[PDB]
Amino acid sequence: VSKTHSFMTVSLIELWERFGYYGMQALIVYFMVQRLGFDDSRANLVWSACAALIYVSPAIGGWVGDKILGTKRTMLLGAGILSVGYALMTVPTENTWFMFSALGVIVVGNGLFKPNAGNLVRKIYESKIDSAFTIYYMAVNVGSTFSMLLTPWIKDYVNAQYGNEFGWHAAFAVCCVGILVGLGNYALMHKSLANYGSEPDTRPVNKKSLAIVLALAALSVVASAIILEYEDVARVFVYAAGVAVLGIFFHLIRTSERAGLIAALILTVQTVFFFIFYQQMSTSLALFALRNVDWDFQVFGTHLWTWSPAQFQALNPIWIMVLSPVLAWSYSIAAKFALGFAVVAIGFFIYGFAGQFAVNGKTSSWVMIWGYASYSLGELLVSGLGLAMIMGGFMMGAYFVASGISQYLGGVVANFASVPQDLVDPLQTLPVYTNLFNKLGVAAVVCTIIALAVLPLMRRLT
Amino acid sequence: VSKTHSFMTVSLIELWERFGYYGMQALIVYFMVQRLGFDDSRANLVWSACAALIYVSPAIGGWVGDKILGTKRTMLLGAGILSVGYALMTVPTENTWFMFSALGVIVVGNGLFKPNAGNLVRKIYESKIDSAFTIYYMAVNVGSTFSMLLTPWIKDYVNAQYGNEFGWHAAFAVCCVGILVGLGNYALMHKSLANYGSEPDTRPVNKKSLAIVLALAALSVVASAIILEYEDVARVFVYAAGVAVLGIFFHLIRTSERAGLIAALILTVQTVFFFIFYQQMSTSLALFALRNVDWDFQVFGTHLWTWSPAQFQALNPIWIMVLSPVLAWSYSIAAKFALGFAVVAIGFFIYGFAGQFAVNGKTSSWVMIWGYASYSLGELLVSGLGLAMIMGGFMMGAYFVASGISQYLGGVVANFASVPQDLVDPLQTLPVYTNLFNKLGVAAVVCTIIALAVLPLMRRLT
Amino acid sequence: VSKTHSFMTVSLIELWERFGYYGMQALIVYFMVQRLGFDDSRANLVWSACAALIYVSPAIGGWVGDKILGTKRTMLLGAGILSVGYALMTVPTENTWFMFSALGVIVVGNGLFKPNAGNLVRKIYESKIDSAFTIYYMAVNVGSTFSMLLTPWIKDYVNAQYGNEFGWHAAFAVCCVGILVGLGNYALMHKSLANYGSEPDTRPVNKKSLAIVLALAALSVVASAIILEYEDVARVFVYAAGVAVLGIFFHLIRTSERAGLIAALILTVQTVFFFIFYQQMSTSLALFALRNVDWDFQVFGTHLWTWSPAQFQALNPIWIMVLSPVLAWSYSIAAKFALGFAVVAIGFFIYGFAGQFAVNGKTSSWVMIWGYASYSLGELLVSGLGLAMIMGGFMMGAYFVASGISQYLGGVVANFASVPQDLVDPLQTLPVYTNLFNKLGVAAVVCTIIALAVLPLMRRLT
Amino acid sequence: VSKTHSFMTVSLIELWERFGYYGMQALIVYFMVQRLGFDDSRANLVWSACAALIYVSPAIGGWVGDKILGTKRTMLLGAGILSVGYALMTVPTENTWFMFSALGVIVVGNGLFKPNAGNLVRKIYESKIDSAFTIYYMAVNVGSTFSMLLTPWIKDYVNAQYGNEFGWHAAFAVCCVGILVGLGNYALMHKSLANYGSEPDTRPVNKKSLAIVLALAALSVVASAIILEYEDVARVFVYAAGVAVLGIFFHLIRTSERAGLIAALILTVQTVFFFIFYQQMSTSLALFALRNVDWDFQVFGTHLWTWSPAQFQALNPIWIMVLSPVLAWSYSIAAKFALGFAVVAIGFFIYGFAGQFAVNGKTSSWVMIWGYASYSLGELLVSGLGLAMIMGGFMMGAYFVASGISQYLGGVVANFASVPQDLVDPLQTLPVYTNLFNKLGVAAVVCTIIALAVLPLMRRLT
């Protein structure tokens, strides 16, 4: 019908997938701490290790879709696997080895879906791909906004009326049917994308490669599950991946009139610094909002609604949609890496500033409003950190793993604010959060000083 | 003599008509609540239903003036009817069916005057019509400024010296003689406009069409009066008009390479949101200033004057004249719909912020100064909402009725802050106003988020 | 030698003349109130009547210098007369008729000096006259800065060491020798200006015209003296001048395609409004600083110096020199008349804001610092009000007298804050100043609204 | 190899030299007051007299390197002498005549190193010398940042673990090995600079000139040492140098169409004003941070680290690196001399503002953060004051000595806040610092008024 209509199909299946995922991520940390018996120091590492596997997962699935299998049907393979994942979350048990299987299925499902969905978005428009993606991302933000608001409300509602289990699991069931809605939506308008495939979707399926990847995918689920439960398995894995990145960089030092890549090393170091700050938003800030934030939302002394601690994470997509047009009007260069560090700093200082003026053991919820406004602003102007990163094949891969490991590294930083489960009084848990965030803000000021001091080197490469 | 001299005549008769009208609107809500025995929940609906009939009234009179009758003599017909309306208000009785006849006469009189007066202003300058109207509007603002200051003072003065009735009715008598002054002013300088008429004013009067419209006008007065008193008659009327707009839109969906009109639907939705916020200024804010605002105006601890609650509405034309040149210097695009929502939000938050810092049961009057500064600023940059709205005949009409119905809808929103007449203590009526305004400000923040999130769709139509 | 050297001579004699004058004006109001037995309501009218005669005095002397006598030797005649004036102030008596003779001599001396000094400055550069005057004015500001700091210190010093009289009179003696220094400075470098005269200085002196003006000058001194003491003589004089301006305007109405002069009438009305606000700075603000300002100047809790109430007026030339380059950098149109009204408003609100936060009966002296910063800023961007004012001969004269009368009118406005000399407690005199200034600030806000509302008329003349 | 590689060598030896020096300057005032028995009024004059000899020292060494000796080997001669200086500081005695020998060796060593190091930086790039120096200065700021943080920590650490002496002396030993590191770093990459020398380094060494300068250098060390201990010897020296500058200026008055140099005199006067304010940062601010600043650094109520009073001076290089790119983005003229005065003023007012809100006898350390942000900002936009200063040979020299003397003059201004060593209570020493800084801020406001009032003269030379 039109290229917009093919863009309509992929944006609809993309909207409903990020719906299911972010509706699950907002509750996955609370689910381990509250519903399951996980202490927070373990729930931080288990999620962060999963967030590391999730981030590097599109590297394989992006290659499987266009070199081996089909970018459409590999994207659909990822979607079907993701259906299983959230369906695996909705069965009501207290089995640990049951939830880790779902998270590993989510990791394998994510790698096969996300890059391929965004890959053919680039193929649909052959250079207004920038106009399409900017509408493609606003569809992501508007979709994840609903789920992060909807799914924690279902969790609160069904638990109040139906007992103890169905609340958390209907929330996950909502994420599962979200995937099925987008799959059904794609099944009806698939005709436009059927004529717009990758290079091998034109050609029929290779069952040798199909059986190989399906066996490796099941192998990967089990390999990802083991990594999550046994924390030390992930440590050595993170260590092994960390030494590899340090090796690819030194091997690149012994090469070439090519001083400009020592700046790429500096851009990688600050990237490791950045993901530790953003990973903090899903770990400590969720626990901070869980224990020491007054969910009662009152504007100038009148009650509106009582928050759910997972719905605070919906303020990230909201603030992205509110600030992206404002930055566009600001039109009428890796130094902006330093500017993002400064924004992240005052965001950690907001939570610190929250401790002084508002004291009841619980700081107000308005902190989560002004806080997430800062982190999302910081995220807005810097994210896509290594997309513009510039014989470069192992260089891009080193950037990937360094960003994946820092996801896990952000989890061990959040453990600095891991409350012992023998500390229940919120008056006593307030210092452990404000102390972490305050020096985290100081550390972000140091990164600002670092990136600003290193600026004469960046201007010298140009 | 000159085109400016023909513009001088129409601007003088326009200045004196908006003088009579706004001098009556500032007191019409108080007149029903104070002088008459109307509870506020009824005075809100009766005025809002009248403000709905007033807004859509120029649709007929604008067509009667240039297609059937004469834009000059239809404008003059409206003016003469408006003379009767304010004269019908000045007779001192406690009869309900007596005031509703005046309001209906005002509705019929308004439709015949306002569009035709502004119609020939466009005809006088054949493209500096933008230069004329900008002077034509400043004449409106300076005229309605006097009456909204003058007429409530007469109401206070004559009531203090002459008892109980003459105060309110001399205020309306002032609005009536205001119309007669402009009619007398037009009767002397009519020679310039006599040579500048519509298409049929050239031709003599058609008494068949004259008698038909005069009978329909009297029919319309009675039809408008019945709608006001019996609130349910207006509800079904508003319902019937609401279903019609929903029908014209769907009938337009089944038509056409014409996706751009789904944005016109979005522009209509936010317009319904907008008029509910501005209708709030005449309903709840007048009652808020009536019961819970300290009329004592003191600047840094010295008494100046004591306000009349109706004179606060004169701050809207004043702030329009103060801010329109400032915005002009700001020169050295339906996203400004979102910007207006943000301004309206902080305006409702001013009244909310008023509740905390200033507490005696009565908030200060400076709230009405900074408040109306915000609403008028918001109004300044967005109003004329659907003038630039773009086979389009039923589309423009759907925009009209959707904006008229929202006038009545703003009245039912004001009823959320309808004080029971058994609640006299201002300390107890302060929460009912601050609670409405505060969440109204939150609702305007949501509209800001909506219009900003929908911005990639508006940029895609261009 | 050079045109700069001829500009050096006139700027040096100009610097020393404004030295003597402003060194006398800063103390003339205090001298009548403190040293003499004048109640403030009389000292306000007597000075304001003199400030009116001073302002319109250059009209005659500017014409005497180039049409009748010699712009150089008329300027020198004014200077010699001004020598007598400050010498007439230095003789220690308590005779009223003795000081009024000096003030009248100052009025006659001022009219003969000021325009002629600035006249040949225009002649020296034949179009960089704008570059010369901008240096010519900075010489005025730096000269009047010294005297307004120096002369009140001499008054305080000599009174403490020598008794009661010599303090005030040595201060005036300092102003007299200031004139003599500039006369001596001119007597040495007169060779450059001797070749740069007016049209008749080339020609020899006409003793018929010389004797006529010298007799009229003595006649004018006595006529000016009588006007000052007997207040009613000035009232009828001000009335007679007021009716004349109202007559010249109506006589101009009966003339001419010349609607643009009704804006000149509006520019005159706001000018009358402006001079009332600036005349307030010399009248009420001097009395406010005299009675209710803590002369103790301490910055963050450490004593620097103790002010003299007359030295606060030196903050006007200081702030002029500080803000004129800032406005120049602001480069990278009678609406600025409205902007000046807004600045004057917040200046009167500073003194009002001073009343609340600082209360001991005496407000801090920092008010005089931030206050004079506002008035001088306001003065900076609007002053020279009718220099750009555009068969125009009686029109310019009407602008002159309307600005002169408003000087006296500003004196009667200051009388609204005239303290009875039976009210000594500063706690009781604080309201009478804060009440005047606060509503004066409200009146300046009205002028802002007026000039902004009238802005569509000004844009229509262009 | 490349011009960058020759720039790499000089920037590495420069980084390590400013490392040793600023690591010594941060502790030299405290060393005299704390470790030695010097009262602060003497430690201020002794350092300021040394800072005067240090500033004018590059005048000889800059001429010795290119006219007599070799810019490379004269720079290396200075470096070797500077090695001796910090080695002379590391031997643990209480002998006064022992430390003064080191400071004099530092003065002779500094003059021979600093200009020659920066001289050939200009020679390496023959016009991107501005691009090299901007990277050359960032290497200076990053190097002095480490030492000013590192050396006071060694002083605190070794004193706590090893007693009383080794702390201060290992800190100086760290500065000595810093010089040796850069000398060793230069000894390895000397091949690139060996081909890039001055005019006579090409030619072999002249042992007549070598022996003469080495004897004069030893003579200069003893001459500099005597000047430091005996304060009156420096006074007459400063007097003799002061009369010389007043003589060179008058001798230049009797010369020449050359009025523009009376502005150079004005630029010199404000320069004397400037160096007194910046010299204050090393004298009084170090003592203020020593006695009346809470070294406990807590952000929003959580302890980070406890400061060392010498490490506050590391905030100057840090803020330079943070603000220099911000000023570069401000791109999208000796009036900026006035702007720097205004910045310095609010910096002295920060310390004054510190006295009111924070009172325990000790003001917070955040004052040192916001304070040094102002002084460094002021320094950023004005420093290099007389580099652009424009038969001019004695004119440049007069500018040098006037800037050197003001270093000593800043020391006598700091003595206005010299606490008697019989005043130990910090509650009693707080006024003596806040009183100095507050009126120092007032004096900087006067310099702002002066430079702004003199601005019409500067615009007239262009």
Numbering used by the authors:
A (entry chain A), B (entry chain A), C (entry chain A), D (entry chain A): 8 to 133, 137 to 266, 270 to 345, 356 to 413, 421 to 492
From the paper:
To further improve the resolution, we tried to crystallize tetrameric PepTSo2 using the LCP method at protein concentrations of 20, 45 and 75 mg ml−1. Microcrystals of PepTSo2 were obtained using a 45 mg ml−1 sample under multiple conditions containing PEG 200 as a precipitant. Since the size of the crystals was too small and data collection from a single crystal was impossible, small wedge data were collected from microcrystals using the microfocus beam at BL32XU at SPring-8, Hyogo, Japan and were combined using the multi-crystal merging software KAMO. We finally determined structures of PepTSo2 from two different crystal forms at 3.5 and 3.9 Å resolution by merging small wedge data sets from multiple microcrystals. PepTSo2 forms a tetramer in both of the crystal forms, and the structures superimpose well (with an r.m.s.d. of 0.83 Å for all Cα atoms). All of the protomers in the tetramer adopted the inward-open conformation, in which a large central hydrophilic substrate-binding pocket faces the intracellular side of the membrane. The structural comparison shows that the present tetrameric structure superimposes well with the previously reported dimeric structure at the protomer level (r.m.s.d. of 1.1 Å for all Cα atoms). A slight movement of H12 was also observed, as in the previous structure, suggesting the importance of H12 for tetramer formation. Furthermore, the tetrameric assembly appears to be stabilized by hydrogen bonds between the asparagine residues in H12 and the unconserved extracellular loop (ECL), which was not well resolved in the previously determined low-resolution tetrameric structures.
